[PDB]
């Protein structure tokens, strides 16, 4: 009764029985170097090149120019899509000259900027990477938490499908850092990278209100994410 | 001795109202020199917030005197504002 | 249409909440020494000339020199006429430089949008001012 | 000489005749009007601007006084330059589809950009005098 949109990421629409819940937010959590950013880029890249659905990529730590070239490192040319006006990178990373805090605040400007970008470019897919970085660029975890919830609420109302990437502490422990799984709660995907040789896995921990293949499945990073051995 | 400032606010939330109040009284009473303070509602002018990469509200973006710097919050900690207007070391 | 794109730009960047301000009459253009008068005037010329040549370029940020021009125009209380004079003189120079190249002066007409851009911004500061 | 140059000389001439500054009544601002009185104002402005444009460039017209009438209504209603440009654009759009249905060049529309500059220039000078001066 909930509908999903196809990610076209090789093997994911099968383990998830269709893809990502439309008009909702899916967390994609994992330690550093698990392919979260890669997942987030591939999601929008396919949306644009296969489905002609424009996308916004919101970045909280990496600069837009390091997103584009780290994407080159993954095998994709984002600047073309930006030049066609089908992809927009929203720079929500910190200013290197510093930002001094001198009282209490919220993240309203961030939310309005995103909503504005969505409507200006007519986007239906949004990627946000990586929301945990925010908690380290401001020391008020409770307002940061609230604003992340309120952002998810707004993204839903705008009828947009969203991926939020999140850092982990370890491959087996808390689902996401700073307890963001308490507000963005319904849809969680976990990515692990453990040891002979590295083994990478994807797990659909939760997809509230619908069916999905349960447990960990292996995948390789070869010009995209490639999940296998799941019948 | 010239100030060019932009204050990004979010509607008429108490934090924004406080910041405008604090900032106005500092400029008119403890500041000497010429100044122009632009107050922008991000709910009404989002593109302006995109241009300046504003994330939090309220945000105080000093254009002059140089160098360009950002101050976040309702501006309760006034010294951080004074140092920016150069009125205190 | 560049006309529709100036219009949408004005809706996006204008209509501020308010401008609070303090000006010094001693530093108004009309009250400056003859040396300070044209020194101000050379700065305005440079900024506007900078604005015009970067106006139609895709990845440049003309809007903050537009804002720097306007702030500068505002604190000196220069008239709209003086702004128009700056545009006209600059266009005259562009015209005599274009004749030596044997090229059309038709692009100059598009810079009229640039002028409208600047005058709009300057007026909006005044229109959105909160006196006293 | 060039109408851009005598738009220019005309603006310098108008500087002496203006008041040092002006005081408006906020009660008569556009933002405080009923939706009915709002559209009543904008249509008068539309009508006046259309008259200005079509008699603009006519030697034997008194365009400067309809310009003065347009500008006065816009200023005391606190109309923005942005709103004026919107009025111009709609009229130019109307002119454009009518010129294509007649098979004539749309290059005259570019000439009306001068007309717009004339009106907004006057309007902006009024705003420069909207705050106290000396």
Curated annotation (Swiss-Prot), chain A:
Similarity field: Belongs to the KaiC family.
Entry domain remark: In the homohexamer the 2 domains (called CI and CII) self-associate to each form a 'donut' layer. The KaiC CI domain mediates interaction with KaiB, CikA and SasA. ATP hydrolysis by the CI domain causes a conformational change that allows KaiB binding. The 2 domains communicate to control ATPase activity. In the homohexamer the 2 domains (called CI and CII) self-associate to each form a 'donut' layer; the compactness and local conformation of the domains varies over the cell cycle and impacts function. CII has the autokinase and autophosphatase activities, both CI and CII have (weak) ATPase activity; CI has the clock pacemaker role.
KaiC domain sequence ranges: 1-228
Binding site for Mg(2+) 1: 37
Name recorded for this polypeptide: Circadian clock oscillator protein KaiC
Impact noted for substituting residue 105 to A: Very little KaiB binding, decreased binding of SasA
Residues at the active site: 61
Curated annotation (Swiss-Prot), chain B:
Domain notes: Has 2 forms, fold switches to a thioredoxin-like fold (KaiB(fs)) when bound to KaiC, KaiA or CikA. The KaiB(fs) form binds faster to KaiC than its alternate form, so less fully phosphorylated KaiC forms; the KaiB(fs) form activates signaling through CikA and inhibits signaling through SasA. The C-terminal region may confer species specificity; C-terminal hybrids do not all rescue deletions in S.elongatus PCC 7942.
Effect the entry attributes to changing residue 38 to A: Loss of circadian rhythm
Documented effect of changing residue 53 to A: Loss of circadian rhythm
GO biological process: circadian rhythm
Binding partners and assembly: Undergoes a major conformational rearrangment; in the free state forms homotetramers with 2 dimers. When bound to the CI domain of KaiC, KaiA or CikA switches to a monomeric thioredoxin-fold (KaiB(fs)). The KaiABC complex composition changes during the circadian cycle to control KaiC phosphorylation. Complexes KaiC(6), KaiA(2-4):KaiC(6), KaiB(6):KaiC(6) and KaiC(6):KaiB(6):KaiA(12) are among the most important forms, many form cooperatively. Binds to KaiA; 1 KaiB(fs) binds to the KaiA homodimer. Binds to the B-loop in the CI domain of KaiC; SasA and KaiB compete to bind to the CI domain.
Family stated for the protein in its record: Belongs to the KaiB family.
Thermal dependence summary for this entry: Stable from 4 to 40 degrees Celsius.
Domain of life where this protein originates: Bacteria
Protein name: Circadian clock oscillator protein KaiB
Record annotation: effect of changing residue 6 to A: Loss of circadian rhythm
Keywords in alphabetical order: Biological rhythms
Curated annotation (Swiss-Prot), chain C:
Domain of life, per lineage: Bacteria
Boundaries of every KaiA C-terminal domain copy: 24-132
Impact after mutating residue 55 to F: Induces a change in the structure due to the absence of the hydrogen bond between D-117 and Y-55
Region Flexible linker, residue ranges: 15-23
Assembly description: Homodimer. The KaiABC complex composition changes during the circadian cycle to control KaiC phosphorylation. Complexes KaiC(6), KaiA(2-4):KaiC(6), KaiB(6):KaiC(6) and KaiC(6):KaiB(6):KaiA(12) are among the most important forms, many form cooperatively. Binds to KaiB and KaiC, the N-terminus (pseudoreceiver domain PsR) is not required for either interaction. 1 KaiB binds to one subunit of the KaiA homodimer. KaiA and CikA bind to the same region of the KaiB(fs) form and therefore compete.
Function: Key component of the KaiABC oscillator complex, which constitutes the main circadian regulator in cyanobacteria. Complex composition changes during the circadian cycle to control KaiC phosphorylation. KaiA stimulates KaiC autophosphorylation, while KaiB sequesters KaiA, leading to KaiC autodephosphorylation. KaiA binding to the KaiC CII domain during the subjective day yields KaiA(2-4):KaiC(6) complexes which stimulate KaiC autophosphorylation.
Family: Belongs to the KaiA family.
Protein name, entry field: Circadian clock oscillator protein KaiA
Swiss-Prot record, chain D:
One Gene Ontology MF term: identical protein binding
Annotated effect of mutating residue 10 to A: Weakens KaiABC formation
Transmembrane portions of the chain: none
Effect listed in the UniProt record for changing residue 7 to A: Weakens KaiABC formation
Ranges of residues in domain KaiA C-terminal: 25-133
GO biological process assignments: circadian rhythm
Domain remark from Swiss-Prot or TrEMBL: The KaiA C-terminal domain mediates homodimerization and formation of a stable complex with KaiB and KaiC. The N-terminal pseudoreceiver domain (PsR, residues 1-146 in these experiments) is not necessary for most KaiA functions, while the linker region (residues 147-179) between the 2 domains is probably required at least for KaiA:KaiB interaction. Undergoes large conformational changes in the KaiABC complex which inactivates the second KaiA monomer, preventing it from activating the KaiC CII domain. The PsR domain binds oxidized quinones.
Record text on subunit structure and interactions: Homodimer. The KaiABC complex composition changes during the circadian cycle to control KaiC phosphorylation. Complexes KaiC(6), KaiA(2-4):KaiC(6), KaiB(6):KaiC(6) and KaiC(6):KaiB(6):KaiA(12) are among the most important forms, many form cooperatively. Binds to KaiB and KaiC, the N-terminus (pseudoreceiver domain PsR) is not required for either interaction. 1 KaiB binds to one subunit of the KaiA homodimer. KaiA and CikA bind to the same region of the KaiB(fs) form and therefore compete.
Family: Belongs to the KaiA family.
Identification of the protein by name: Circadian clock oscillator protein KaiA
Portion of the parent chain present: 149 to 282 of 283
């Amino acid at each position: 009764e909930v509908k999903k949109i196809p990610t076209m990421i090789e093997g994911f629409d099968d383990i998830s029985h269709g893809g990502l819940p439309q008009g909702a937010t899916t967390l994609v959590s994992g330690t550093s170097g698990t392919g979260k950013t890669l997942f987030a880029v591939q999601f929008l890249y396919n949306g644009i090149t296969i489905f002609n659905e424009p996308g916004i990529f919101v970045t909280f730590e990496e600069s837009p120019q390091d997103i584009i070239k780290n994407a080159l490192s993954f095998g994709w040319n984002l600047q073309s899509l930006i030049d066609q006006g089908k992809l927009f990178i929203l720079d929500a990373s910190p200013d290197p000259d510093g930002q001094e805090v001198a009282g209490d605040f919220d993240l309203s400007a961030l939310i309005e900027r995103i909503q504005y970008a969505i409507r200006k470019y007519k986007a239906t897919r949004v990627s946000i990477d990586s929301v945990t970085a925010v908690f380290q660029q401001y020391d008020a975890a409770s307002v940061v938490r609230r604003e992340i919830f309120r952002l998810a609420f707004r993204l839903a109302q705008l009828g947009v499908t969203t991926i939020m990437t999140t850092e982990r502490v370890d491959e087996y422990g808390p689902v996401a850092r700073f307890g963001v799984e308490e507000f963005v709660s319904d849809n969680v995907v976990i990515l692990r990278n453990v040891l002979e040789r590295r083994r990478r896995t994807v797990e659909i921990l939760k997809l509230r209100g619908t069916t999905h293949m349960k447990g960990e499945y292996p995948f390789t990073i070869n010009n995209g994410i490639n999940i296998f051995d799941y019948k | 001795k010239t100030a060019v400032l932009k204050l990004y606010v979010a509607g008429n939330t108490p934090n924004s109202v406080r910041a405008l109040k604090t900032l106005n009284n500092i400029l008119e009473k403890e500041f000497k020199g010429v100044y122009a303070l632009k107050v922008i509602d991000v709910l009404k002018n989002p593109q302006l917030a995109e241009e300046d990469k504003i994330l939090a509200t309220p945000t105080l973006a000093k254009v002059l005197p140089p160098p360009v710097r950002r101050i976040i919050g309702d501006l309760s900690n006034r010294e951080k504002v004074l140092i920016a207007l150069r009125l205190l070391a | 249409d560049p006309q529709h794109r100036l219009s949408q730009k004005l809706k996006e960047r204008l209509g501020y909440l308010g401008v609070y301000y303090k000006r010094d009459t001693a530093f108004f253009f009309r009250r400056m020494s003859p040396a300070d008068k044209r020194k101000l005037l050379d700065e305005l010329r440079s900024i506007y000339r900078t604005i015009v040549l970067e106006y139609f370029n895709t990845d440049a940020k003309v809007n903050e020199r537009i804002d720097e021009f306007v702030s500068k125009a505002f604190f000196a209380d220069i008239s709209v006429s003086q702004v128009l004079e700056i545009h006209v003189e600059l266009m005259d120079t562009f015209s005599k430089q274009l004749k030596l190249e044997g090229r059309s002066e038709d692009i100059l007409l598009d810079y009229r949008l640039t002028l409208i851009d600047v005058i709009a911004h300057l007026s909006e500061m005044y229109r959105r001012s909160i006196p006293r």
